[PDB]
Amino acid sequence: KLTLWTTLDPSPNCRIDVDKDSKLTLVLTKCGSQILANVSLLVVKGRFQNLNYKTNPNLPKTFTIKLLFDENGILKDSSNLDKNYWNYRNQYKNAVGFMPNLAAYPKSTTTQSKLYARNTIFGNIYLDSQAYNPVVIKITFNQEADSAYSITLNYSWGKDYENIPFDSTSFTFSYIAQE
Amino acid sequence: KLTLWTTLDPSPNCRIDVDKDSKLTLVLTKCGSQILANVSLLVVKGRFQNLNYKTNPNLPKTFTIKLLFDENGILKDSSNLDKNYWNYRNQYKNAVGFMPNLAAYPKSTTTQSKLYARNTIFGNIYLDSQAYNPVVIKITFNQEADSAYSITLNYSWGKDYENIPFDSTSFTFSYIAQE
Amino acid sequence: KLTLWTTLDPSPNCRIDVDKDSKLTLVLTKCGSQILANVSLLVVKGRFQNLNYKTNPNLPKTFTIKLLFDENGILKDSSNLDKNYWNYRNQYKNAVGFMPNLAAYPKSTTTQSKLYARNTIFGNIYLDSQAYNPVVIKITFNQEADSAYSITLNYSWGKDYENIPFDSTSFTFSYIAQE
């Protein structure tokens, strides 16, 4: 009832560029009016598996993973996360109690040039369990115009990494629940 | 019963320098012995609404918001937060269960004004949803000698911001509850 | 029943180098599938009580505190934390519900000493309630080969501190519970 998560299954479950290029671990625990969230990310194959900006001049320093939800709090197929890996810890009918509160985190109006900053959380996370491999995780609620609710995970970094795996440490955050 | 918060009402509710110059969003959720806290801050008018240190030589790079509580956990009149915006999520009589634990976070003795470091939490938060607009939030418990309990929110920054709104990202923390 | 903690007893309770050289405050609160954790550390005597790299050339800039648990989630005598200071908030028989999940945070296999990055959390904490005294706390789960479960707290810093007490600010994190 009270936890929505990616399983701990070792199978890849997420698309950054290509199907199953990544494994997202996301745990959402309902503590009444707040969701306690825990996240980590491993890239298992493709261009972000091993970062080397000395040898690959064309490699970006960002990617984004989106969880898109309908008006019943059901994960949409268009999400980067595979629906087959998303369920209660013990497919579901209602998870509006896990959704980011729309009054707290309003969607952008047609006339609105961006979201309120309160819709965003920043975290400093690290690759390969080392403090000198920083990555910025930018978590934004309800940014995706075509979904009832959304959680957007933007990863970005500045370092010219040389043969560093995108294998992230864990980060905790919370957000205000819709109900 | 289990969440004490500022409403999500769009109305300003907080005084930095002037009445209703700011809108504090603070959610305290009781998970037994710990309070799970979520905070953001928007300045709606006055000298901190738009930061420009190129054009305003006299502008500080800090301000402080205090929540002062009596022995029943009731918000006191001299608090920066307006009492009309502070209530259980669904005029309260007792909120000692939400107060920062006095054994964990002792008040300063007459022979020292200087608290144990455990009474303080630091967070790195950001303005206008950009990682290159850092602000330090310093949360201190029970620093106010003249109140039974207190939560002090000190905001400070170093950057000579040029036309940046004080519109903060969200931050989560926790603290040990009095009961 | 839902909180496992170091008491708030003012007595030292922890060994960095020598018995009772430190006082760890650690609070683990069970919110179903996640443990909400709160930590601070005061060094009360010995070489880390007052850091001065100007006057002591031989002083390290790191130390580690380990909590080692048996298959019933009972703190082992080999831990840096003294067992006499570790109990439920209101000697215990079973605390597996507080243990770091072995599927989430696997122990290193004979064929690899190297943990998944998701076993680690980094935090930036501070000494003496000042933002310009940074310390890195590195929390790692299930790293200790000789125990069923473990929480390892590695503290490190870079600054040539001059007469700064190791009196840390508080930090919140969470982790996935074994059951």
Author numbering:
A (entry chain B), B (entry chain A), C (entry chain C): 186 to 275, 283 to 371
The authors write:
Each protein forms key interactions to promote cell infection, with the terminal domain of the fiber, the fiber knob protein, interacting with the viruses’ primary cell entry receptor. Sialic acid (SA) usage has been proposed as a cell infection mechanism for EKC causing HAdV-D. Here we highlight an important role for SA engagement by many HAdV-D. We provide apo state crystal structures of 7 previously undetermined HAdV-D fiber-knob proteins, and structures of HAdV-D25, D29, D30 and D53 fiber-knob proteins in complex with SA. Our findings demonstrate a conserved binding site for sialic acid, common across the species D adenoviruses, therefore suggesting that, along with CAR, the receptor can be used to initiate cell entry.
HAdV-D15, D24 and D32 were crystallised in only their apo states, whereas HAdV-D25, D29, D30 and D53 crystals were also soaked with sialic acid. In this article we present seven novel structures of apo state fiber-knob proteins of species D adenoviruses. These provide a good basis from which to conduct structural analyses.
